[PDB]
């Protein structure tokens, strides 16, 4: 995948070159997007709009830490959609990791989560955040145990997932027509054209449920209607049945 690779570490140890090789990234000097390795973290920038700043995955601070403390945890809309209740903490597979925001919430409540991400740049950003997260003296311990990243496509990797999770969470990038962070991220990640193909394999893998995030008025994934869903402001979480063992 092409992208402008920028080194702002001053180390000269080849960290960026190793990272590009590992994720199969190709340097593109005139690319609209830039992946920058800084002394603090790996971030993504929209070169034509510096005012938007850079975005990076941070499980320890910022917005994720604020949501963990004030979001409600088991009380979150996504947590109730996955079925979290009482001492029931299902194993979850987030087939569309992205920035890992929803994944982190579920793992923070107590769920064991496996994240899948096929975009090499996104995966690189998540892996850097995970490295910093695992290193945290406070959450590093449980984070490493309840949140793992898998670089693969859920369209074909979901089938052979073992052990089978009770729930599969789906939030592919929808073709939005209607903040800074989102503008930068969406400039990289366009609509996932083959998203409708995730429902079938997801319902076969999950033993209990499949949750699909959908914005208001957006059609259900794969046009498969469902009577169950958690509704919040702006979006809803469609709930489907899985395939019991
Ligand atoms: N088959 C697939 N396998 C892995 N990742 C996939 C995928 N189809 C789409 N994706 C990823 O799914 C992500 C959805 S973006 C949503 C991010 C997430 N809801 C959050 O909490 O932030 C995108 O980054 C896209 O690259």
Short mmCIF file of C-alpha atoms in Angstrom, two decimals, residues 18-120:
data_model
loop_
_atom_site.label_atom_id
_atom_site.label_comp_id
_atom_site.label_asym_id
_atom_site.label_seq_id
_atom_site.Cartn_x
_atom_site.Cartn_y
_atom_site.Cartn_z
CA UNK A 18 11.42 -2.28 9.27
CA UNK A 19 7.84 -1.12 9.83
CA UNK A 20 7.16 -0.61 6.12
CA UNK A 21 8.58 -4.05 5.33
CA UNK A 22 6.55 -5.70 8.10
CA UNK A 23 3.29 -4.12 6.91
CA UNK A 24 4.13 -4.11 3.21
CA UNK A 25 4.03 -0.32 2.90
CA UNK A 26 5.46 1.47 -0.14
CA UNK A 27 6.84 4.98 0.19
CA UNK A 28 4.99 7.43 -2.07
CA UNK A 29 6.63 10.89 -2.00
CA UNK A 30 3.66 12.72 -3.47
CA UNK A 31 0.99 10.81 -1.55
CA UNK A 32 -1.94 12.76 -0.09
CA UNK A 33 -1.53 10.85 3.19
CA UNK A 34 1.56 10.50 5.40
CA UNK A 35 2.50 7.91 8.01
CA UNK A 36 4.95 9.53 10.42
CA UNK A 37 7.10 7.82 13.04
CA UNK A 38 7.66 10.33 15.86
CA UNK A 39 9.52 9.97 19.17
CA UNK A 40 6.15 9.57 20.87
CA UNK A 41 4.24 7.35 18.43
CA UNK A 42 3.26 6.48 14.86
CA UNK A 43 0.63 8.86 13.49
CA UNK A 44 -1.38 9.46 10.30
CA UNK A 45 -1.51 12.90 8.64
CA UNK A 46 -3.52 14.54 5.85
CA UNK A 47 -0.70 16.45 4.15
CA UNK A 48 -3.00 19.02 2.49
CA UNK A 49 -4.67 19.86 5.79
CA UNK A 50 -2.06 20.32 8.57
CA UNK A 51 -4.65 22.10 10.72
CA UNK A 52 -6.30 18.71 11.24
CA UNK A 53 -3.15 17.51 12.96
CA UNK A 54 -2.14 13.88 13.19
CA UNK A 55 -4.11 10.91 14.50
CA UNK A 56 -2.74 7.97 16.45
CA UNK A 57 -4.06 5.09 18.53
CA UNK A 58 -3.76 5.72 22.26
CA UNK A 59 -5.30 3.28 24.76
CA UNK A 60 -3.58 4.93 27.72
CA UNK A 61 -4.70 8.53 27.38
CA UNK A 62 -6.80 11.01 25.45
CA UNK A 63 -10.30 10.18 24.24
CA UNK A 64 -9.99 6.45 24.92
CA UNK A 65 -9.06 6.95 28.59
CA UNK A 66 -11.88 9.47 29.01
CA UNK A 67 -14.42 7.06 27.48
CA UNK A 68 -13.17 4.24 29.72
CA UNK A 69 -13.81 6.33 32.81
CA UNK A 70 -16.99 8.18 31.78
CA UNK A 71 -18.40 6.01 28.99
CA UNK A 72 -20.24 3.62 31.29
CA UNK A 73 -18.46 0.38 30.43
CA UNK A 74 -21.05 -2.39 30.56
CA UNK A 75 -23.53 0.46 30.30
CA UNK A 76 -22.30 1.44 26.83
CA UNK A 77 -24.63 0.92 23.87
CA UNK A 78 -22.13 -1.37 22.15
CA UNK A 79 -21.65 -3.36 25.37
CA UNK A 80 -25.37 -3.95 25.73
CA UNK A 81 -25.61 -4.91 22.05
CA UNK A 82 -22.97 -7.63 22.39
CA UNK A 83 -25.00 -9.04 25.26
CA UNK A 84 -22.82 -8.12 28.23
CA UNK A 85 -24.92 -8.74 31.36
CA UNK A 86 -24.06 -9.64 34.93
CA UNK A 87 -21.05 -11.95 34.89
CA UNK A 88 -21.55 -12.84 31.22
CA UNK A 89 -18.49 -11.52 29.35
CA UNK A 90 -18.48 -13.13 25.87
CA UNK A 91 -15.39 -13.70 23.77
CA UNK A 92 -15.64 -11.24 20.90
CA UNK A 93 -14.10 -10.99 17.46
CA UNK A 94 -14.06 -7.45 16.07
CA UNK A 95 -13.92 -8.20 12.36
CA UNK A 96 -13.41 -4.52 11.46
CA UNK A 97 -10.94 -3.10 14.06
CA UNK A 98 -10.30 0.37 12.63
CA UNK A 99 -9.02 2.55 15.47
CA UNK A 100 -10.04 -0.11 17.96
CA UNK A 101 -12.25 2.26 19.95
CA UNK A 102 -15.20 -0.14 20.35
CA UNK A 103 -12.83 -3.08 20.79
CA UNK A 104 -11.07 -1.33 23.66
CA UNK A 105 -14.37 -0.63 25.43
CA UNK A 106 -15.40 -4.28 25.27
CA UNK A 107 -11.98 -5.45 26.48
CA UNK A 108 -12.04 -2.86 29.28
CA UNK A 109 -15.35 -4.18 30.58
CA UNK A 110 -13.85 -7.65 30.81
CA UNK A 111 -14.30 -9.31 27.40
CA UNK A 112 -11.54 -11.19 25.60
CA UNK A 113 -11.35 -9.50 22.19
CA UNK A 114 -9.58 -10.45 18.97
CA UNK A 115 -9.31 -7.63 16.44
CA UNK A 116 -9.05 -8.15 12.70
CA UNK A 117 -7.76 -5.42 10.38
CA UNK A 118 -6.90 -5.75 6.71
CA UNK A 119 -5.73 -2.20 5.93
CA UNK A 120 -1.93 -2.28 6.39
#
